[PDB]
Amino acid sequence: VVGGTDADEGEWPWQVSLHALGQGHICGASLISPNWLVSAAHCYIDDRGFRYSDPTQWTAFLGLHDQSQRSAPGVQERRLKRIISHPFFNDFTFDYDIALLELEKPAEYSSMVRPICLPDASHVFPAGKAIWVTGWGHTQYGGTGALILQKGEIRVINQTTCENLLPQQITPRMMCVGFLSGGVDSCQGDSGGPLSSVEADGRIFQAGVVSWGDGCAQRNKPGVYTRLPLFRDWIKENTGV
Numbered sequence: 001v002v003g004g005t006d007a008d009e010g011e012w013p014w015q016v017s018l019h020a021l022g023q024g025h026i027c028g029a030s031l032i033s034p035n036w037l038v039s040a041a042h043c044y045i046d047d048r049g050f051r052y053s054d055p056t057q058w059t060a061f062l063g064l065h066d067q068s069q070r071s072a073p074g075v076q077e078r079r080l081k082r083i084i085s086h087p088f089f090n091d092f093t094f095d096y097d098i099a100l101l102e103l104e105k106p107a108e109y110s111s112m113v114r115p116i117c118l119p120d121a122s123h124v125f126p127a128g129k130a131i132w133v134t135g136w137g138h139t140q141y142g143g144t145g146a147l148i149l150q151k152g153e154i155r156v157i158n159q160t161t162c163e164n165l166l167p168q169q170i171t172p173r174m175m176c177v178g179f180l181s182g183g184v185d186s187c188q189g190d191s192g193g194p195l196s197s198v199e200a201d202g203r204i205f206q207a208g209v210v211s212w213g214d215g216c217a218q219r220n221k222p223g224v225y226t227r228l229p230l231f232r233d234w235i236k237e238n239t240g241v
């Protein structure tokens with residue numbers, strides 16, 4: 001997160017850190033039920049050096065605050081038994097950049113571990129609405145990741161404006177969130193983490209998945225996120241959630 005601040009311990013109890021064997025934190029995720037996480041499909045693509053699509057190569061840390069304190073009280077460690085990347089994922093445009101991760105054993109709900117709410121298919125997150133982004137990613141483009149979980153406040157950007165800022169790259173599965181002036185943005189290592197929106201009764205709903213951007217926090221280059229309401233049915237059909 002660029003331009004953010006330290007989160008409070010337990011402030012985002014749905015935020016998850018995904019570590020690949022021998023590599024440390026690679027991507028974020030969100031807890032949506034006792035058995036299921038939402039993340040980004042592009043984190044789980046094989047390359048010639050490592051089989052990122054293989055669920056046995058991963059560990060999920062729930063209730064984590066400080067990346068250097070992965071055994072602290074309240075932190076839960078879980079393996080994965082399945083990774084479901086969206087079948088329409090496009091590895092050139094990163095259309096449909098969303099995945100579902102099945103925990104090998106259920107999370108235990110606590111003051112530090114709690115699911116985010118999922119929006120109904122017909123809900124619209126309106127232009128201009130305040131949204132929170134969280135993660136352990138870089139605090140500057142090309143910089144270094146944060147040990148302590150970071151939070152930042154950004155805003156939904158009109159879809160036509162989004163398309164014009166990034167021509168020939170914004171599909172209807174994508175949403176721009178941030179500022180045209182730059183300054184606050186997600187960044188490398190935040191991929192797969194949730195957008196958190198405070199809704200009408202103060203409960204937090206997931207508004208998107210961190211996906212990509214041109215650099216980080218640059219003027220006229222807002223972060224691009226995978227939408228959530230569009231996938232409510234896909235999630236229900238695949239997880240029962």
Ligand SMILES: *[C@@](O)(c1nc2ccccc2s1)[C@H](CCCNC(=N)N)NC(=O)[C@@H](NC(=O)[C@H](Cc1cscn1)NC(=O)CCc1ccccc1)C(C)C
Binds near residue numbers: 092
């Ligand atoms: C996410 O944290 C990551 N996923 C992985 C997976 C494997 C290893 C490492 C990482 S980091 C980030 C989140 C970035 C959010 N950015 C903003 N909100 N501003 N996702 C990525 O890094 C994706 N790649 C990009 O965003 C790249 C970075 C870059 C290289 S040069 C300037 N910026 N963006 C582009 O290349 C822009 C052009 C483009 C071409 C084609 C498709 C999309 C964009 C991810 C790895 C694809």
Ligand SMILES: *SC[C@H](NC(=O)CC[C@H](N)C(=O)O)C(=O)NCC(=O)O
Binds near residue numbers: 114115116117118203
């Ligand atoms: S909608 C998902 C979360 N709801 C719960 O966790 C309910 C469980 C309680 N223990 C209960 O109902 O008694 C939720 O609301 N997440 C967002 C938030 O702001 O907490």
Ligand SMILES: [Mg+2]
Binds near residue numbers: 112
């Ligand atoms: Mg604690």
